[PDB]
Amino acid sequence: EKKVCQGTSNKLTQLGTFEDHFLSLQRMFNNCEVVLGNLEITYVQRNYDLSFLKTIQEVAGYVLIALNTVERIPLENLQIIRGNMYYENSYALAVLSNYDNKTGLKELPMRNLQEILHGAVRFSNNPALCNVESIQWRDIVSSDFLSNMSMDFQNHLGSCQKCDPSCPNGSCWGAGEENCQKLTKIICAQQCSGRCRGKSPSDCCHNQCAAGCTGPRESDCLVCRKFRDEATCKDTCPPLMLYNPTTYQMDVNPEGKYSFGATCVKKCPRNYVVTDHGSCVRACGADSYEMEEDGVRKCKKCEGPCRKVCNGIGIGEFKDSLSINATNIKHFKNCTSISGDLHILPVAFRGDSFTHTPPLDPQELDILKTVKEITGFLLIQAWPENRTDLHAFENLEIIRGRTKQHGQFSLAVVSLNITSLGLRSLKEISDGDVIISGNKNLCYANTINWKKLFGTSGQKTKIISNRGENSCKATGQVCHALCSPEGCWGPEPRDCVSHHH
Amino acid sequence: SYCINGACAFHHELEKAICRCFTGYTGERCEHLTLT
Ligand SMILES: *[C@@H]1O[C@H](CO)[C@@H](O[C@@H]2O[C@H](CO)[C@@H](O[C@@H]3O[C@H](CO)[C@@H](O)[C@H](O)[C@@H]3O)[C@H](O)[C@H]2NC(C)=O)[C@H](O)[C@H]1NC(C)=O
Ligand SMILES: *[C@@H]1O[C@H](CO)[C@@H](O[C@@H]2O[C@H](CO)[C@@H](O[C@@H]3O[C@H](CO)[C@@H](O)[C@H](O)[C@@H]3O)[C@H](O)[C@H]2NC(C)=O)[C@H](O)[C@H]1NC(C)=O
Ligand SMILES: *[C@@H]1O[C@H](CO)[C@@H](O[C@@H]2O[C@H](CO)[C@@H](O)[C@H](O)[C@H]2NC(C)=O)[C@H](O)[C@H]1NC(C)=O
C-alpha cells in the first residue's frame, strides 16, 4: 500500500504567518503519496522549497493551488485527481491567482497528470505561468465537464521557454522532453473503451484503468478508476456478503474487504470505522455511532447509550458557521454524540453583526449537558467569566479527535476565566494533542495524569501560563485529600480522576 | 465588521474579502485565537 495523508479543507484561509502556513503544509503532505482529501497549496512564498510534493501520486478531492509566489511547485508525479469534492461547486483543479509584479508560479511540471475523474479546471490570472497554456485538456478532463472549463492565460512576464519538438502538438507541461504531455485518451482507437498506450487497437487499456496503463490486463493500470485490490483494479471491493442461491440466503464472505478511500482493505485502519455499506469512514456521523463489535469498530444505529447524533460546527446545518450561537445552541438540544468538531469563540458572546447573530445567553450553554461523545475536537476559546468551570461538559465522556484543530489539538482550553476544568466524566482522549493555556485562574490542570486518558502513543500536552502551582497551593485550591495521584478536575471528591464519586 | 480581528482587503479577481489577522488571531474572519 501507499503512504497516505488526509489533506486539508481550508480553501483560501491562511494560518498564522507565512512560515507557520508552510510548516503546516510541509508537516501535512510530508511523504504523502495518496491524499485522501484535498490538496491545498496556498501562500507559498519566495524561495520556499516544495520538493516534498514530488511524492504525491493521486488526490481524491480537489487541488487548489493559489495565492503562492514560489517560482516552482513540483507536482511531478500527481497522476490522477479523482475530484470527489469540488472547489466552489465546479472545479477539481483550481490554479487561481499566484502572482506577487510578474514573478511566481512559473513552473508547474505536472508531467504525469492525465486523469480528472470528476469536475472541471480553472486557471485564472497567473502572469508567470509558462507551459500550461499549451496543454490539451480534452485528454485529461472528462467530456461531461468540458463545458465548465474556465481557462485563462494572459502572460505578462513573457519569459517562458518553448516546448520540446518531440511533444505532440507542442503540448508540454514544461521545457524538456520529460515534460511532454502524454496523451492517453484522445489518441486511442474506436475499439478502446477507455485509455490506451498507443494509436493501435492492441494498445487499449483495461476498463478499470485510469490515466493510462502499461499492459492490457487489469493489473497493469497506472491508477485504478474505482477500487484497487492488492495489485488488481476492480469495479468494487469483494463484498462482505454473498448471495447463496441454494439456501436463498446472504452468507458471510471470507474474502470480503472494506473500502478505504480507493483501496480494498481486509480491516479498516486506526482512527477509521466500518459502516453498514462496507466503507471505512473517519467517524460515524449520520444516525450512527462507534461500537466495538466482533472486536472491530462498526457504525451502529443510535440506540441505547446513544440518544441523538448531531453535527458539529463546520458541517451539516452548522456548516459555514463559526461557533455556537444564540441560534445554534437550540439545535444542540439533547444530543449525546457530536459528529465532528466543537467551536466556542468570543464572537459567540459578543455577537456578530455580519451574521445577524445576537449575543449568546450563557445559561443556554447548559444545553450541552447531554453531550457525552465528540468525534472531532473540543475548542473553547471563550467562556462566561461569571462561570468558574466547564459545567456544560459535566457529563462529556470521550473525545475521539478523528478531526483535529489544525491537524494537532483534540482539546483546546484557551484564555478562559475558569478556576477548574470540571470535566468529571471525561475518561478518554483517543487521538490528538491537548493544549491548555492562558487560563490565568485555572489551577488543577497540571495534576491530571493525561497518559491515562490518551489512547494513541505520542499525544502531547501544552498546559502553560495558567495559574501557578504554588499560587494554588498557598490558597488550598489543590486536589482533594480523597483524590489519587492521577489528579483532579476540581477541588471536590467528585472531581478526582481516581477514588472518585 | 467582516474581519473581527484583522484588516479587510478585497481581491477583485477572486471577488473575495480576505482578512489579514492581527498579532494573536487567525481564521477566515480572524475569529480564532492562534494556538501555539
Ligand atoms: C451563528 O449561527 C448561525 C446559525 O447557524 C450562523 O448563520 C449562518 O451563517 C452563514 C454565513 O454565510 C450562512 O451560510 C450561507 O451560505 C451560503 C453560501 O455562502 C449563502 O448563499 C447564504 O445566504 C448563507 O450566507 C448560513 O445559512 C447561516 N445559517 C442560518 C442563518 O441558520 C451564523 O453564521 C453564526 N454566527 C457566526 C458569527 O458564525
Ligand atoms: C473571572 O474569574 C475570577 C475568579 O473566579 C472572578 O473573581 C471572583 O469573583 C467572585 C465574585 O463573583 C469573588 O467571590 C467573592 O469573594 C469575596 C472575598 O474576596 C467574598 O466576600 C464574596 O462574598 C464573593 O464570594 C472571588 O473572590 C473572585 N476571585 C478572586 C478575587 O480571585 C471574576 O469575577 C471573573 N470575571 C468576571 C468579569 O466576573
Ligand atoms: C519530514 O520528513 C523528513 C524525513 O522524511 C524529516 O527529516 C528529518 O528531520 C529530523 C529533524 O531534525 C532529522 O533529525 C532527521 O535526520 C531528518 N531526516 C530523516 C531521514 O529522518 C522532516 O523533519 C519532516 N518534517 C516535518 C515538518 O514533519
In order, the DSSP letters of B1-36 are --STTEEEEEETTTTEEEEEE-TTEESSSS-EEPP-
Residues of B in contact with A381 (CB under 8 A): 32-33
In one letter, which amino acid is A433?
A: D
* Residue appearing with cell numbers 475558569: A418
Angstrom distance (rounded) from CA A179 to CA A167: 8
Which method resolved this structure? Answer: X-ray
Q: Is A26 in the pocket of ligand 3 (CB under 6 A)?
A: yes
**Dist CA A447 CA A356 (whole Å):** 42
A241-301 CATH: 2.10.220.10
Q: How far is CA A71 from the centre of its chain?
A: 27
Confirm if A81 and A113 have CB atoms less than 8 A apart: yes
- Name the DSSP letter for residue A164: P
A104, A135, A33, A22: CA torsion to nearest 10: 10
- Are the beta carbons of A387 and B10 closer than 8 angstroms? no
Query: Does residue A417 have its Cβ closer than 6 Å to ligand 2?
Result: yes
Domain A309-495 has CATH 2.40.100.10: no
Work out the widest C-alpha separation in chain B, in whole angstroms: 33
Task: State which residue of chain B sits closest to A152, comparing Cα positions.
Answer: B13
Read off the DSSP letter of residue A360. P
Q: Which of A163, A154, A153, A235 is nearest to A194 (CA)?
A: A235
Domain B1-36: which CATH number of 3.90.1560.10, 3.30.70.100, 2.10.25.10, 3.40.50.2300: 2.10.25.10
Place of cell 490528538: A432
Can you read off the three cell numbers belonging to residue A414?
A: 484557551
Collect all residues with Cβ–Cβ distance below 8 Å to A294 and sequence separation of at least 6: none
Closest to A436 in 3D by CA, of A458, A454, A416, A456:
A416
Q: For residue A500, which of A336, A490, A450, A400 has the smallest C-alpha distance?
A: A490
- The residue extents of the domains of chain B are 1-36
Cα dihedral sign for A295, A297, A301, A306?
Answer: positive
* Single-letter residue type at A84: N
How many Å separate Cα A105 from the centre of its chain?
25
Cell 498546559 sits on residue: A463
What value, to the nearest 5°, has the Cα angle with vertex A71 and ends A67 and A74?
95
Q: What is the C-alpha separation between A426 and A434, in angstroms, rounded?
A: 13
Closest CA to A378 of A417, A422, A410, A421: A410
Torsion angle, alpha carbons of A332, A335, A340, A342, to 10: 50
CA distance B35 to chain A (A): 8
Round to whole Å and give the CA distance between A197 and A183: 9
Q: Which residues contact A481 (CB under 8 A, 6 or more apart)?
A: none
Ligand 3 mutation target, pool A25, A26, A30, A32, most atoms within 8 A of CB: A30
In terms of DSSP bridges, do strands A461-464 and A80-81 run parallel, antiparallel, or are they unpaired?
Answer: unpaired
Contacts of A454 (CB under 8 A, 6+ apart): A429
SS3 at position A482: coil
Q: Tell me, what DSSP letter sits at residue A196?
A: B
β-bridge mates for residue A290, sequence order = A299
Residue nearest to atom 27 of ligand 3 (CA): A27
Half-sphere exposure of A57 (CA within 13 A, CB side): 13
Alpha helices in A285-329 (DSSP H): none
Size of interface A-B (CB pairs under 8 A): 45
Q: Encode A423-433: b = buried (16+ Cβ within 10 Å), e = exposed.
A: bbebeebbbbb
CB A109 within 8 A of CB A136: no
Start-to-end Cα distance in chain B: 26
Round to whole Å and give the CA distance between A27 and A5.
10
Type of residue numbered A343: H
Chain A residues touching B2 at Cβ < 8 A: 354
- Local structure of A379: helix, strand or coil: strand
Judge whether A213 and A193 are in contact, CB under 8 Å.
Answer: no
Residue A211 contacts residue A82 (beta carbons within 8 Å): no
Q: Provide CB contacts within 8 A for A144, sequence distance 6+.
A: none
Burial degree of A364 (CB within 10 A; 0-12, 13-18, 19+): middle
How far away is chain A from the Cα of B29, in angstroms, using its nearest Cα? 9
H or E element, residue A349 = helix A346-350
Ligand 3 atom closest to residue A26's alpha carbon, by position in its atom list: 27
Largest CA distance in chain A: 86
Residues of A in contact with B33 (CB under 8 A): 381, 414-415
A93 touches A116 (CB < 8 A): yes
> CB-side exposure of A204: number of CA atoms within 13 Å?
11
The minimal CB distance from A97 to the residues B11, B28, B36 is found for B11
Q: Of ligand 1's atoms, which has the minimum distance to the CA of residue A322?
A: 39
The three three-digit cell numbers of residue A215, written as one number: 499492459
Q: For residue A51, is it left (φ>0), alpha (ψ between -120 and 50) or beta?
A: alpha
Residue A16: closest CA among chain B residues belongs to which residue?
Answer: B26
Q: Please report, in angstroms and rounded to a whole number, the separation of the first and last CA atoms in chain A.
A: 48
Position of cell 485510469? A210
